[PDB]
Amino acid sequence: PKEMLRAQTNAILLNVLKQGDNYVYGIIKQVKEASNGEMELNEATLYTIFKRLEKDGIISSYWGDGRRKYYRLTEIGHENMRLAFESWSRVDKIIENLEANKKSE
Template sequence: MIHPSQRPAAEEAFSADLLRGHTDTIVLATLRRGDRYGFEIYKTIRDATGGTHEIKEATLYATYRRLAKDGLVEAYWGDESQGGRRKYYRITDAGRAVFRRNVAAWVATRDVVDTLLLTDKEPRS
């Protein structure tokens, strides 16, 4: 783990709460690339950020259960050819639809926030 004093300013400002609000979409995005087992999803997310940010395993496993309950992913047991038996997750058509809606909502939200933060119209003193 990198000590906070060694992180760039942008990383210090990163909000884990903001990331946590998009855990479902992040997991669905990972599964769009192919079926994966639980810890593999964790590693994929961690590695995508160069190890600087991760979602806690407990949060992810709760997410997997919720996504399966909601029909957005299907869980199945893999074979034992690579060691222990692992539970894999596969995105469903409903999961793909939710992913597309969530990404569209994220883009719209990001655009509004960018507009509000990057506006050239600052009040004159």
């Protein structure tokens, strides 16, 4: 499901930035390496995603050094990742509790 691929890619890209400011080609290599070559991101895909995240204030950019454009997770972005991770833990709990409670009937 397209809805899901998008989410997972975003998930990953934010984790990369959560590990350090980086530029598009560095991000691509890092992901290709952490995925054992299973996820080879196109440049244009990253620009698409980052344009949305920059508009929503979840990331921002700036010039580094060979002059590269760097991307960073904002404070809001670290906050969304935190809210997200928490909300999903509760969800996994509630699922366990559904099972538990169902069996006790």
